[PDB]
Amino acid sequence: AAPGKPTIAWGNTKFAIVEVDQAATAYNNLVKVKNAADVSVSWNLWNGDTGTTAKVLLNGKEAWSGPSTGSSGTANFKVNKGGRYQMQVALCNADGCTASDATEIVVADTDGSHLAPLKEPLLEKNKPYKQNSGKVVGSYFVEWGVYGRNFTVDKIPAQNLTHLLYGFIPICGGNGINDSLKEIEGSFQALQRSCQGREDFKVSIHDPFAALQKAQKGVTAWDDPYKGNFGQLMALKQAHPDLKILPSIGGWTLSDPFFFMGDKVKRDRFVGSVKEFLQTWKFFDGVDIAWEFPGGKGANPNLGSPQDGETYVLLMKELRAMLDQLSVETGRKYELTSAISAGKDMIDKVAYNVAQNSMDHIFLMSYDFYGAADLKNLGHQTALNAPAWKPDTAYTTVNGVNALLAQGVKPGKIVVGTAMYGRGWTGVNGYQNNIPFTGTATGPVKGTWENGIVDYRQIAGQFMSGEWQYTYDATAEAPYVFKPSTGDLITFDDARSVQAKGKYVLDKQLGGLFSAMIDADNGDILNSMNASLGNSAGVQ
Ligand SMILES: CC(=O)N[C@@H]1[C@@H](O)[C@H](O[C@@H]2O[C@H](CO)[C@@H](O[C@@H]3O[C@H](CO)[C@@H](O[C@@H]4O[C@H](CO)[C@@H](O)[C@H](O)[C@H]4NC(C)=O)[C@H](O)[C@H]3NC(C)=O)[C@H](O)[C@H]2NC(C)=O)[C@@H](CO)O[C@@H]1O
């Protein structure tokens, strides 16, 4: 007779191709990439003959075979593809094979193949759009937004984006390499801990807890190998396979290391580490370079060189070459993008007409034109055009776009920036003709989280009632609110100014729109980004 029916032993059924060390703070130790997951199964046979061969099947296909030598057995084998499997143990002899009932096992991988899709309802004022305009609709999500702001990946209105950028991936380096981080309490030290035993100029993760370990919706079980932002982003990819999720390297306070990459030894090491990063974290679809900025005038007053423009173009070329190789190895398309200054003076330090051949999208940072850092010269921080009271205004969206076009950048490359926050001043005074911008300020407006910056959500929620004046400047295409008694003045984007930008993008055949930061919107801004680019209402 055929053997008795084996009983699969109670035991761990969750395995991982990329393992995460739960007691490690250094990125080198935190993550272990393997070619395959080490899987184990045991069984008992309570009734009958134990057969002469034991097999482990995954969805009916043999993953392991060995002699059946007793009433209990154990099998260890490798599984090299992520997902969920119906595992059985079968005992065979010359008279037949007898298979156990199936037990599901989970083999995790960083493409999120083991995860249920993270398909969450739209929150706040967010309304559903189909991505059918063919235009970019992008936004940045910040790693630390999960703390005080409590804005997690499950709160991202993901169906209303083409591109989701993760800010920010740091580049390893201590004294002289990441000095800008020292301005943020504990932040430099956090990076040094993450990069312990890791070479300068390789990428890492700034806050491994937030990125990988913090319990979040859909990734709360203790033996879920990827939690935090990355785990949720993996599940998000399962829900939105066409969403481009890009890691953004740099940003204001993590940009210092770019200034050393004129040394090709360092640049090669960096590009290599990015490749490794993408091979490790498979849910990512490319890389965004947020170098602020070639030539300097970023966070660090002691960095910036005339060489930086050349370095930028070389970096983009070499990144593209690495990504092209990754693409044909994987059969995937990878994107290369960059967030850049919108100031003409800044833009002309770089030959974007050359660099564009390496890039899928240029994220034009057409915001922060004005702010609390200058209390004497006030203006619209993210306007399309100059205002009527100062038509020679240098920093406008159109001037940034025109600077790029003048170089020879193709318009389809250019993605225009919208702000999901306001900047502002307090104590504004000495202004003429009921235009507060013509006055001067005494300090920054009180901020939502940091001085001089207000979440759009709070502007809409608090500063569009009471004593607050509201004005839409139709010449600049820019709203502002003003509280005369305290001289609080806030410049921001609203649904109408975003609409003007979208129409401008369509008229000029630009690439689309993107925003910073997604956590600060109540839905109004992203709704308008979608609508104005011609995306159809409804779900796809
Ligand atoms: C287009 C352009 O070039 N605009 C610039 C403008 O950026 C300059 O102003 C600077 O802006 C950057 C953001 O772009 C500010 O940096 C952020 O600062 C905050 C506060 O420290 C950082 O948040 C903290 O991050 C840590 C992790 O390091 C978390 O642990 C904390 O929870 C978190 N704290 C809070 C309260 O959120 C954040 O990481 C920084 N972001 C980045 C990407 O670096 C910078 O402070 C700001 N500097 C000044 C002086 O305002 C502006 C300066 O004049 O010039 C242009 O307008």
Residue numbers in the entry: 24 to 563
The authors write:
Similar to a monorail car, they have long tunnel- or cleft-like polysaccharide-binding sites and processively hydrolyse crystalline cellulose and chitin, major types of biomass on earth, to water-soluble disaccharides. During the processive movement on crystalline chitin surface, chitinase keeps binding with single chitin chain in the catalytic cleft and repeats chemical and mechanical steps.
To investigate the mode of substrate binding and chain sliding, we generated an inactive mutant of SmChiA (D313A, K369M, F396A, W539A, and E540M). In this mutant, the amino acid residues constructing subsite +2 to −2 and stabilising the Michaelis complex were mutated. This mutant was designed to observe less stable substrate–enzyme complexes than the Michaelis complex. These crystal structures showed that the mutant can bind to the substrate at various positions. The mutated amino acid residues were not involved in the interactions between the substrate and the enzyme in the observed intermediate complexes. The conformer A was major and interacted with the reducing end of chitohexaose via a water molecule, but the protonation state was not clear.
